[PDB]
Amino acid sequence: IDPETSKYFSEIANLFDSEVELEERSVICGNALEETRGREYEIATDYIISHVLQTLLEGCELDQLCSFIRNSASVFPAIAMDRSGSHVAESALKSLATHLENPDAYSVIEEALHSICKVIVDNPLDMMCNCYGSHVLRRLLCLCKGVSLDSPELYGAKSSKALAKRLNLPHQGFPGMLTYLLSGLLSCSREDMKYLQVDQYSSLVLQTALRLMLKQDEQLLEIIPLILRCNGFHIETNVAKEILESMKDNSFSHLVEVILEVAPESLYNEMFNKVFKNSLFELSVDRCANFVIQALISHARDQEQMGIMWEELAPRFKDLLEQGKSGVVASLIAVSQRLQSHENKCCEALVGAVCSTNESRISILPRLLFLDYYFGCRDKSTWEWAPGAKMHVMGCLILQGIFKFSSDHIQPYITSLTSMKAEYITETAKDSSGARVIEAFLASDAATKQKRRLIIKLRGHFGELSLHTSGSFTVEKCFDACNLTLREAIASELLDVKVDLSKTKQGPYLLRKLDIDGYASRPDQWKSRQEAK
RNA sequence: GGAGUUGACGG
């Protein structure tokens, strides 16, 4: 990097910080990329100029992008594993992806992908394990699949969407290039594969590839035995022992979670029996492995498996809540619903784990709303509430699930919730997790008289509730469930705060759906229209 | 327009 090179790329950078329209902008972007020929590694890895080279790549036309990828392909793994050049490699890929929807570019993108996949597949294992290169590889696998849109779920992150699925709450791409690239990533010795399993960044790469092969059974049946080192699909006794001992490892545990999420039926069952079938509780108490069990539970196929999971885990619900593993319980409860097995056994086991004595069972709701305060407190026989405290996210999720069982199985839950005193019920609705418990109860098949009894204890608080963004949903769901007398009561309370309510994000919608303006001006006509529903 | 598990990731 000489001063004429720095000067020139600085001067291009400063020209775009204006005076130059987009049609000229992209021809300048390409004439400048030609100034990188023979210097691609030096420019792309420079801590300053690499940022300009990103701008050029995201601003040039297809022919010059592909020319840059063809010229730098022999140094592309080195660029991709540099802390600055990896954003350059990803910028080349993001820019390539913008031409996906152009039918006239299919073979020109494929040729570019091929230059890249060829140089990577020739030597992949340090790029897979490199903290920068594994981001480039994850993006590259997505592009070969025709996904151009960053999904934190594909790149390995948590979200609320995956949590819903676990709890029950498209471009053709370049198929042969995805298969070719991924065969290159997995064609190493079984001994190399054993350390890919437990390295953070190669695990993240294989997670992305697995998620992209979702529902490609013919391919998933070739890939997963390779990743698990066991080449009908069969896991031998010693391989199953090795899989099981790596299962508490941070990186591997994330990988088996995704294997369980995409595994075909034949392969799920073999892993259930040969790997997990008598270690479910021991894995459920591990920092890392318990999420594998959550993934195992969520994807069970038949009722025989439910019974096995029930036997090993349900006597141990209390341990799982005590030891911070509420998500294992939540997953077991949620799948008994979909498999239609052990529903009542699951509801009764959860009560028995939170309430030892017959007397304490009226308190199942508060103790589950505040799971961590109840199990964490000094004296449990005199624990009642946690005033002002934020309620427990997973406790409340468990309860959202509980209230989708038939009412026959959840009577201790309906009685406990509907008999909480008004101060506790209003506190629950004002809490962003607690309002979801209430709303799940309002949508349950509990009786109307039982729903109305809870709604009536909220009287005097619908105004304050409506101002909360979250509480505004509870007000509406209560209103819908009510008779004319309480509909008119809620309207009066919302009417006393119409000024504040209109100045909030959800206020306008709430004043419209309940028609609070028409209640104030023409109360006779509002009562008539409300009675017809 | 809603709280979102207890264990990871970049110049």
Distance from C-alpha of A54 to C-alpha of A59, rounded to nearest angstrom: 9
Query: Can you tell me whether residue A199 is helix, strand or coil?
Result: coil
Q: How many CB atoms lie within 10 A of CB A18?
A: 6
Q: Are residues A92 and A197 in the same domain?
A: no
Paired tokens of A118:
């060829």
C-alpha distance from residue A517 to each of A11, A254, A489, A491, A512 (Å):
61, 53, 14, 10, 8
C1' of B2 to CA of A381 (Å): 34
- Report the amino acid identity of residue A512: R
Does residue A387 sit within a domain? Answer: no
At which residue do the structure tokens 């609320």 appear? Answer: A160
Determination technique for this entry: X-ray
What would the two tokens of residue A386 be?
């946690």
Contact A198, A245 (CB under 8 A): no
Hey, how many other C-beta atoms are within 10 angstroms of the C-beta on A200?
14
Exposed e or buried b per residue across A468-491, where buried means at least 16 C-beta atoms within 10 angstroms of its C-beta: bebbbbbbbbbbebbeeebbbbbb
What are the tokens at A120? 């990577």
- Residues A324 and A152: their CA atoms lie apart, in Å, by 26
Structural tokens at position A165? 């699925």
**Of A229, A247, A274, the domain-final residue:** A274
C-beta neighbour count of A261 within 10 angstroms: 18
Q: Which two tokens mark A104?
A: 């006239």
**Are the beta carbons of A247 and A253 closer than 8 angstroms?**
yes
Q: What is the H or E stretch that residue A251 is in?
A: helix A250-262
Residues of chain A with a following break (C to N over 2.5 Å): 18, 169, 231
Report whether A426 contacts A442 (CB < 8 A).
no
What b/e readout covers A383-422, taking b as 16+ CB neighbours within 10 angstroms?
A: bebbeeeebbbbbbbbbbbbbbbeeebbebbbebbbbbee
* E strand or H helix at A523: helix A523-531
Q: Which residues contact A274 (CB under 8 A, 6 or more apart)?
A: A235, A237, A240
| Distance, CA of A79 to CA of A74 (rounded, Å) | 10
Residue A126 tokens, joined? 């340090």
Strand B and A208 CB separated by under 7 Å? no
* A123 and A52 within one domain: yes
Instruction: Write out the two tokens for A187.
Output: 């064609």
Residue recorded with tokens 């009560």 = A351
Exposed, middle or buried by CB within 10 Å (0-12, 13-18, 19+), for A102? exposed
Residue A383 region by backbone torsions, left for phi larger than 0, else alpha for psi between -120 and 50, else beta: beta
* Cα A399 from Cα A360, distance rounded (Å): 18
Judge whether A177 lies within some domain: no
d(CA A302, CA A283) in angstroms, rounded, equals 21
Please name the residues in contact with A57: beta carbons below 8 A apart, sequence gap of 6 or more.
Answer: A29, A33, A65, A68, A88, A91, A92, A95
Nucleotide nearest residue A507, measured CA to C1': B1
Cβ proximity of A207 and A134 under 8 Å? no
Q: Quick check: is A300 in a domain?
A: no
Q: Give the residue carrying structure tokens 């204890």.
A: A457
From the CA of A472 to the C1' of B2: give the distance in Å: 9
Q: Give the list of residues 6+ apart from residue A160 with CB closer than 8 angstroms, or none.
A: none
The reply to whether A119 and A197 lie within a common domain is no
A472 touches strand B (CB under 7 A): yes
Nucleotide nearest to A286 (CA to C1'): B7
Classify residue A27 by its DSSP letter. H
CA angle A55–A56–A60, rounded 5-degree value: 125
Are A143 and A16 found together in one domain?
yes
Tokens of A518: 């028409």
Report d(CA A205, CA A196) in Å as an integer.
Answer: 10
Residues A144 and A192 in one domain: no
CB A95 within 8 A of CB A56: no
Give the C-alpha separation, A250 to A248, whole Å. Answer: 6
Distance CA A210, CA A259 (A): 7
Domain boundary among A234, A249, A274: A274
Paired tokens of A39 = 């210097």
- Letter for the amino acid at A138? R
By the 8 A CB rule, do A370 and A385 touch? yes
Q: Give CA–CA dist A399/A370, Å, rounded.
A: 12
CA A468 to C1' B2 (Å) is 9
Shared-domain flag, residues A11 and A144: yes
Distance CA A394, CA A377 (A): 18
Instruction: Compute CA A263 distance to the chain's CA centroid, rounded to the nearest angstrom.
Output: 18
Confirm whether any atom of chain B, the nucleic acid strand, is less than 7 Å from CB of A166. Answer: yes
**Is residue A402 situated within a structural domain?**
no
Residue A62 exposed, middle or buried by CB count within 10 Å (0-12, 13-18, 19+): middle
Give residues 122-141 of chain A lying near strand B (Cβ < 7 A): 131-132, 134-136
Per-residue HEC secondary structure of A84-139 comes to CHHHHHHHHHHHHHHCCCCHHHHHHHHHHHHHHHHHHHCCCHHHHHCCCHHHHHHH
Strand B contacted by A197 CB (< 7 A): no
The b-or-e profile of A180-193 (16+ CB within 10 A means b, else e) is bbbebbbebeeeeb
Residues A224 and A131 in one domain: no
CB of A441 within 7 Å of some strand B atom: no
What's the token pair of residue A427?
Answer: 């506190």
Q: Identify whether residues A7 and A112 lie together within a single domain.
A: yes
Angle at A90 between CA A84 and CA A96, to 5 degrees: 145
- The answer to whether A467 CB sits below 7 Å from nucleic acid chain B is no
CB A44 within 8 A of CB A79: yes
Does residue A408 sit in helix, strand or coil? helix
Angle at A144 between CA A138 and CA A147, to 5 degrees: 75
Nearest protein residue to nucleotide B4 (CA to C1' distance) is: A160
Last residue of a domain, one of A118, A149, A180: A149
Q: What does DSSP assign to residue A389?
A: P
Angle at A306 between CA A305 and CA A312, to 5 degrees: 90
Cα separation, A69 vs A89, in Å, equals 9
Range of the domain at A120: 1-149
Query: Nearest to residue A396, comparing CAs of A428, A354, A357, A421?
Result: A428
Whether residues A145 and A8 share a domain: the answer is yes
Task: Flag whether A384 is in a domain.
Answer: no
Among A50, A110, A32, A123, CA closest to A86: A50
Do A205 and A120 share a structural domain? no
Q: How many CB atoms lie within 10 A of CB A435?
A: 23
Q: Which nucleotide is nearest to A135 (CA to C1')?
A: B10
How far apart are the C-alpha atoms of A425 and A416, rounded to whole Å? 11
Interatomic CA distance for residues A387 and A12, integer angstroms = 61
Query: How does DSSP classify residue A235?
Result: -
What CA–CA distance (Å, rounded) separates A303 from A309? Answer: 10
Alpha helices in A419-521 (DSSP H): 422-429, 434-442, 448-457, 462-467, 471-481, 484-495, 498-502, 507-513, 516-521
Asked whether residue A136 falls in the same domain as residue A199, the answer is: no
Question: Domain count of chain A?
Answer: 3
Residue A282 lies in a domain: no
Within-domain flag for A49: yes
Structure letter (DSSP) for residue A249: S
Q: Are residues A100 and A195 in the same domain?
A: no
Q: Whole-number Å distance, CA A244 to C1' B8?
A: 20
CA quadruple A331, A335, A337, A338: dihedral positive or negative?
positive
Radius of gyration of chain A (CA): 29
> From residue A46, how far is each of A85, A309, A490 by CA, in Å?
8, 55, 64
Say yes or no: Cβ of A82 under 7 A from any atom of strand B. no
DSSP state for residue A19 in the 8-state scheme: -
A324 touches strand B (CB under 7 A): yes
Q: How far is the CA of A190 from the C1' of B6 (A)?
A: 32
Q: Is A216 left (phi over 0), alpha (psi -120 to 50) or beta?
A: beta
Long-range contacts of A37-42 (CB under 8 A, 24+ apart): A37/A71, A38/A71, A39/A5, A40/A68, A40/A71, A40/A72, A40/A75, A40/A79, A41/A72, A41/A75, A41/A78, A41/A79, A41/A85, A42/A1
Q: What is the SS3 assignment for A419?
A: coil
Residue A16 belongs to a domain: yes
Whether A166 and A295 have beta carbons less than 8 Å apart is answered as yes
Cβ contact A400 with chain B strand, < 7 A: yes
What distance in Å separates the CA atoms of residue A83 and residue A90, rounded to the nearest whole number? Answer: 12
